[PDB]
Known about the structure:
By secondary structure, the protein is α/β, with parallel strands linked by helices. Helix content is 29%, strand content 22%.
Amino acid sequence: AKNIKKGPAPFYPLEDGTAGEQLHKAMKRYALVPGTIAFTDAHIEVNITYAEYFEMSVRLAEAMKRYGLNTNHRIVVCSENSLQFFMPVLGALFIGVAVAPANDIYNERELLNSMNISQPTVVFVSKKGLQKILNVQKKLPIIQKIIIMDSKTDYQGFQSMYTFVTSHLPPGFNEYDFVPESFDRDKTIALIMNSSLPKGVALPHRTACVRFSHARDPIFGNQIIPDTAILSVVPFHHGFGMFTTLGYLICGFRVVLMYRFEEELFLRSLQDYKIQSALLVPTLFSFFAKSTLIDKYDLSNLHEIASGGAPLSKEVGEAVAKRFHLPGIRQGYGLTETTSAILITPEGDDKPGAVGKVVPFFEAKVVDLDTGKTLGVNQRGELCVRGPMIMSGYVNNPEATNALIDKDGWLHSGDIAYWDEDEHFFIVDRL
Ligand SMILES: Nc1ncnc2c1ncn2[C@@H]1O[C@H](COP(=O)(O)OC(=O)[C@H]2CSC(c3nc4ccc(N5CCCCCC5)cc4s3)=N2)[C@@H](O)[C@H]1O
């Protein structure tokens, strides 16, 4: 067991209750401080506060409950990153309805394939995705109700979130008396995510509650510090964006988003919103390695730049760190089947080329590619991980599940890795 790498102790113990209960508890607390910003849209410059966000999510929860949705139902949220995206997401977590994020700009075909797995009864969609959802509905009439996200009034005959809510709230509904549903966090699916044809990945509420431990951890996440703002350019419909944003909400952070990358807008949003931490996909890292405009901006509040979800070379990492006058790069590794990152750069413990260390509650090992036997330091082999954020299985695909997770609960990542003397993990790119 000398060669099984173990995750440290979480700074805070893992709270009880569902992921909806934990999100509801914390967002209510932030709702009660007027003017606490939850999301800022850098394109349209509008802020929405925790009070606005909490109340509309609670209203959506109760409206979905009075409509008839329960743990036997799934919704789809199909929308690019927006101020509205997490309203139906939170509302459905509050009542144990599973949420299937759909890749907003997917062509009709991949939308159909994602949604054929997830079998949603109600679809929330932004205006520019409506016609595709309509076409998917022709082939999957289990879709019985379509709700427009970025409207206040009805749009093209369909209810908005706001008119849908007032259609089903009881008289005298009180947003601050509402109690989120209580249920078995291990068996109630919180999210159905699309795999890297893609499979549906069922994630129980428990895996998000573990993520929330990491999110608030001073070592493996962000210190809950007032007036902390994040600038994230990560799609909400994949696991990297989904569970960093849910964690930032748990921490009461200001989540500044852009859904169309622009060099000047991004750098000016870093400066004007006094971003402390910036969240990029690795191909935008490759971009800012080439940028020669960073020195024009006041990035003194910038404490970290973070990457995940795809290979990042050590050289690109160091090049970006230099461009932004930072000691290094914060990084994380995970799979959709893993909920979120299970290898994370601890704060200030950064090492170039490394993806980080095993997170609290998890264990990781490297196994020989021919045998399966546990290798020691620096030996290269397959990365295997085990912990409470592993998915419960692929949706209606038990064989693909078992190919990936053996009877003892190790997940075979299909990646080549090694850990070093200080226990940092490196992912070896096959080519
Ligand atoms: N870091 C890294 N290097 C190289 N290859 C990597 C990689 N991460 C993933 N991969 C490759 O991607 C596939 C799996 O693809 P996927 O689409 O199934 O999913 C993901 O990559 C996705 C699931 S969640 C996730 C990450 N989640 C988080 C969460 C938090 C963080 N941070 C930021 C870092 C610093 C603060 C701590 C929190 C990061 C990430 S990433 N990615 C896999 O096979 C591998 O090949």
